[PDB]
Amino acid sequence: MKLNKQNLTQLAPEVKLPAYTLADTRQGIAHIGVGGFHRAHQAYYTDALMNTGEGLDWSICGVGLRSEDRKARDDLAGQDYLFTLYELGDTDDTEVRVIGSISDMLLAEDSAQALIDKLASPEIRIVSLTITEGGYCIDDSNGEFMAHLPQIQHDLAHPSSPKTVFGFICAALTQRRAAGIPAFTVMSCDNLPHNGAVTRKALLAFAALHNAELHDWIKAHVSFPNAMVDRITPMTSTAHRLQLHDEHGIDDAWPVVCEPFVQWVLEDKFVNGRPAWEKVGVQFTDDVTPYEEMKIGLLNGSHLALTYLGFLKGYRFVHETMNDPLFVAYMRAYMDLDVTPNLAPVPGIDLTDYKQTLVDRFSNQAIADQLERVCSDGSSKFPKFTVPTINRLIADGRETERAALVVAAWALYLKGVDENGVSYTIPDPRAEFCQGLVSDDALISQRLLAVEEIFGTAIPNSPEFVAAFERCYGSLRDNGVTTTLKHLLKKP
């Protein structure tokens, strides 16, 4: 049965349906970057609130700034913006639920002004983001906003026909001001240690390139809450979509699949209101940064440590690496010896138990999370997930070998062929550029480690780290992933 409003009451019995009248919802959030995570997390909690009969005025209007967003818009529009949330887990108490909290999705390609108008409408009180780890344009080595990027220069030159998130948000805020409409809160839901602070720094830096006045007004009227957002959400591959039809009879052009576990801890900093998400499990705390630092360092850091080595070994899913005891031992050593000592205190959390839950969640066999997804965009993910840890090891004079292996694994992985002879394309926005850095084995450490917006300035200037990187890369190439891990796991 095709998922749409017409068929909503004719799906399998076990399928949970929105308990509110879809036609009575009104928009309050504009979400930029409608992919899987937004749908499995923010749209999920908002739909859960609506099912209690509250917050029906907090519907989401999706926003797509990229050509690839057209397919998402068309797939959802063909379902009256309904989509299936399909939870997959082993120690499972999982549900299949139709989500009705997204009511539309606008594309910049259809009209820049229609999108500005939507973002500037008084009903829209929060502009949320899942624009990916590298979408904020801040160079982590020096904390500088990357004003020179072409799309940023484009928006400065054509503020009324922007293409980036910064250009759209500034144009919307200017229009709201001219109408006497209050600012909205900008709510980042991306994996950055201090995601709200980064969003603030970037938007202000961009606004400053326009005029001090817009910059000053934004600094004083817009809030940028930090958050820890957590819910493993694989890509919806054909197999995931077919499994939904096979098991629950729904023909959904684009369901979202995700693990049963879900958490959201937010700083309560909203200038123009927000849904009562705490009624459905969202947690609010004064300073969420140590929790987000913790999750990024341990969960995302471990994901990168597993993913390139796993792809090279020939694995294709996260649970497969967890079925390899050498990978599990390596992740535990990385988490316990390299990351843990660097973490700020996390009130109410026992780190040992938390690290075990990461092992448990990554071991979920039913979810089938793709290493191709986890590997994607390493050029933007390294400075967020791994380099901070490496820099601390370098500064402390601590062993860098396990962390260096992650970077060496990525370097070898960029050549595009695994140990079984299977060739792959590199899913990275700077793929061509990164593959170029590894065209000559003898020059890899000099070229790859010298990209400042990826690795910073400590790594290339560290003899200890460079030697470890070179040892690791040669071992991976000559002896393979398995033998390299065995040797490493025996170092003191």
Ligand X SMILES: NC(=O)c1ccc[n+]([C@@H]2O[C@H](COP(=O)([O-])OP(=O)(O)OC[C@H]3O[C@@H](n4cnc5c(N)ncnc54)[C@H](O)[C@@H]3O)[C@@H](O)[C@H]2O)c1
Structure tokens at 413: 């992985």
- Binding ligand X by CB under 6 A: which of 32, 99, 414, 468? 32
Phi, psi of 401 (to 5 degrees): -55, -45
Residue 229 binding ligand X, by CB under 6 A = yes
Minimum CB distance to ligand X smaller for 114 or for 212:
114
Nearest approach, Cβ of 277 to ligand X (angstroms)? 17
* Distance of alpha carbon 350 from alpha carbon 459, whole angstroms: 31
Which stretch in 205-213, 230-238, 267-275, 314-322 sits in contact with ligand X by CB under 6 A? 230-238
Residue 108 binding ligand X, by CB under 6 A = no
- How many Cα neighbours within 13 Å face the side chain of 477? 17
Site string for ligand X, 176-205 (x = CB under 6 A): --------------xx--------------
Residue 368 binding ligand X, by CB under 6 A = no
Minimum CB distance to ligand X smaller for 192 or for 339:
192
Nearest approach, Cβ of 362 to ligand X (angstroms)? 12
- SS3 assignment, position 297: helix
* Distance of alpha carbon 491 from alpha carbon 384, whole angstroms: 27
In contact, 335 and 351? CB cutoff 8 Å: no
Which stretch in 124-132, 153-161, 326-334, 476-484 sits in contact with ligand X by CB under 6 A? 124-132
* Distance of alpha carbon 322 from alpha carbon 308, whole angstroms: 14
Minimum CB distance to ligand X smaller for 83 or for 469:
83
In contact, 102 and 83? CB cutoff 8 Å: yes
- Closest by alpha carbon to 22, among 69, 83, 80? 80
Minimum CB distance to ligand X smaller for 133 or for 418:
133
Q: From the CB of residue 332, how many other CB atoms can be counted at a distance below 10 Å?
A: 16
Largest CA distance in the chain: 66
In 122-267, where does DSSP find H-type helix?
150-157, 165-178, 195-210, 212-221, 238-248
- Binding ligand X by CB under 6 A: which of 8, 20, 25, 35? 35
Residue position matching structure tokens 């780890």? 133
Residue nearest to ligand X according to CB distances in the complex: 35
C-alpha 322: how far from its chain's center? 21
- Binding ligand X by CB under 6 A: which of 29, 31, 36, 85? 36
Site string for ligand X, 58-87 (x = CB under 6 A): ------xxx-xx------------------
Residues that bind ligand X (CB under 6 A): 32-38, 64-66, 68-69, 130-133, 135, 165, 190-191, 229, 231-233
Which residues define the annotated binding site for NAD(+)? Answer: 36-37, 66, 69, 133, 190-191, 233
